[PDB]
Amino acid sequence: HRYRPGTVALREIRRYQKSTELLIRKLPFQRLVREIAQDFKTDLRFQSSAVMALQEASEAYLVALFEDTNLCAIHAKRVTIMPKDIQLARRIRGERA
Amino acid sequence: PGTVALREIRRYQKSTELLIRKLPFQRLVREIAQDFKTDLRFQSSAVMALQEASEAYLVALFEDTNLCAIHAKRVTIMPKDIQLARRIRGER
Amino acid sequence: KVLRDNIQGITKPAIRRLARRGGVKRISGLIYEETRGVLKVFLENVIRDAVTYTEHAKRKTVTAMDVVYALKRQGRTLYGFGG
Amino acid sequence: NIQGITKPAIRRLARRGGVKRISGLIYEETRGVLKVFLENVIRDAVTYTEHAKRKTVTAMDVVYALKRQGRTLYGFGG
Amino acid sequence: LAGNAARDNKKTRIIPRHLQLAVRNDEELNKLLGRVTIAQGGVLPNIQSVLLPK
DNA sequence: GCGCGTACGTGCGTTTAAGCGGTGCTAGAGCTGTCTACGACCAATTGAGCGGCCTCGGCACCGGGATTCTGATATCGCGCGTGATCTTACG
DNA sequence: CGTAAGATCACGCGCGATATCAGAATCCCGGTGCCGAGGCCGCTCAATTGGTCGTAGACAGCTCTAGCACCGCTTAAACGCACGTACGCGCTGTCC
């Protein structure tokens, strides 16, 4: 049959909050890191542990940001996060101006 | 309604003089300190620095509260706005 | 002389002026008590740190330097009173 | 390159964050935010590496950078 | 607290997730590590009310 | 978008403790002279943690079986609407 | 006697909770292998003590200035009510 919209989302929330394995596949993230680094200095090498540290920190930061964004959306009687939610969250955090 | 609100906003954003009255604030600070340890005295400049910090903090908090209220298609700040602002700030 | 209920010394017009400097236009009734609570928490933390520094100094008087050090501890550095 | 951070990956990160419903423009906004964050952290890490006269950014550089930004990380030789 | 958690999760060896659970579930430790992200730590299970089915 | 309940603004009136100044008392901070305990270091001594190398196992994986959970449907129940029978009123 | 209004019973139609099927989740269990954890042995490298020196700190005494308290004065600041008006709450239509 068919699951009603919004149920598999909750199931995925339960599934992912119980696990700790990273959610961005390694190689695209690594290539993004190398691209970003290149603009600051040429011909650079990275220790795999450094890439893992970056990935851990970024993923944790994004998860926290999404938590705050979800709180913002809920504050507006909403259930879908929208760009304005992220902007407000970062603004209050003091990251964005 | 609401005109004098804007007038007051402009007036108090033009000036810098402190908004909380001096002697109630001093009494409150003395009480709070008393509960942490008895028989404390204060340099008046220490009280003034405490008041400056408190007022700056409260004005920034109110800015964030107003930002939260606008986010909810509202114009009046309400306690849940402050709670959201402090949560997002990482305060407890 | 005993001190009691001074937190109400933060009168409604004062909190209102503060919000005005914060750009707020319309203020709900319940805001005032929440603001008093927030102010009390902030003062408790700052004065806890300041009184700790004062105790280490073995002084019976709290100095502005103590307040400035406490504020710098809380990631709320302040200029204009030394340090 | 930046697009390699796939929409569904952002969906997984949000799910772990507790989000139920996601907007279309979110994905791109998240890509921008992640770009900025990586930019700052990697800038600091490189800065350290340059000062170390090494062509190989180390994990210690990343840890020190994250500490600078008030985002301390554990598990890589703190 | 981490050993307690590992017992609750029925494991003999502590892994990061146990440390994360012990820290975040504990109020004072969570406050102390307020600006620390623990590698392979994950998050606590927490679903907002309004997101739950009716 | 529409419709309804209402919190509190301005103004007015009333009342009060917050700043100035004036005096008076003074607590412990700040600045000189005495006196004394102890850690860096050098020699010499001794011993413990890190690493190399062995040994061992709690859990992942596979595969299978058993217990649970939404979506759909349908009966029981309750509530609303209509007709038939009994009752009362009028003609 | 005959017609019209009202109460109750029977029958029919509509909204809500809760018995059942069924595919997808989730948990438990038999049996195997492994890379990480644990222990023993060497080896440097680390920790401790005999004994010295200047250095910092503790102590005591003289000096006093803003810290504290009250009195009187003046007045800007704070609190209660009429009200009505825009704001908050709730229901509803549309389609993104």
Side-chain angles (χ1 to χ4, degrees), chain C residues 7-57:
Chain C
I7 181 59
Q8 290 302 321
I10 308 301
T11 60
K12 182 170 122 180
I15 304 160
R16 151 183 316 277
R17 291 195 296 281
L18 285 168
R20 292 282 178 258
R21 186 166 295 174
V24 179
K25 188 193 182 196
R26 199 148 189 282
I27 299 171
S28 166
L30 294 182
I31 280 291
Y32 303 115
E33 277 295 347
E34 199 80 0
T35 312
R36 292 191 194 84
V38 160
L39 176 62
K40 189 156 173 293
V41 173
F42 175 88
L43 283 161
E44 282 175 10
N45 290 333
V46 177
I47 304 163
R48 180 191 287 100
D49 287 6
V51 167
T52 304
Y53 279 115
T54 325
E55 288 179 331
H56 179 329

Side-chain angles (χ1 to χ4, degrees), chain D residues 4-74:
Chain D
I5 307 308
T6 59
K7 168 222 199 81
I10 301 157
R11 229 171 92 273
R12 291 189 290 274
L13 293 159
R15 287 282 189 279
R16 170 171 287 162
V19 174
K20 178 175 175 160
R21 216 156 171 270
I22 295 171
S23 153
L25 304 116
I26 287 299
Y27 304 108
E28 276 295 313
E29 263 269 10
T30 281
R31 295 200 180 92
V33 179
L34 173 61
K35 192 189 180 71
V36 168
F37 174 89
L38 288 167
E39 278 174 12
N40 295 285
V41 173
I42 295 173
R43 182 185 288 94
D44 279 5
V46 169
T47 306
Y48 278 117
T49 309
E50 301 256 44
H51 183 268
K53 297 175 182 175
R54 286 184 280 90
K55 291 198 186 176
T56 309
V57 172
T58 56
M60 297 303 305
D61 298 329
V62 182
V63 171
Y64 295 147
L66 293 162
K67 197 161 194 139
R68 275 213 71 263
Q69 307 281 344
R71 309 219 78 262
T72 296
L73 172 65
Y74 283 8

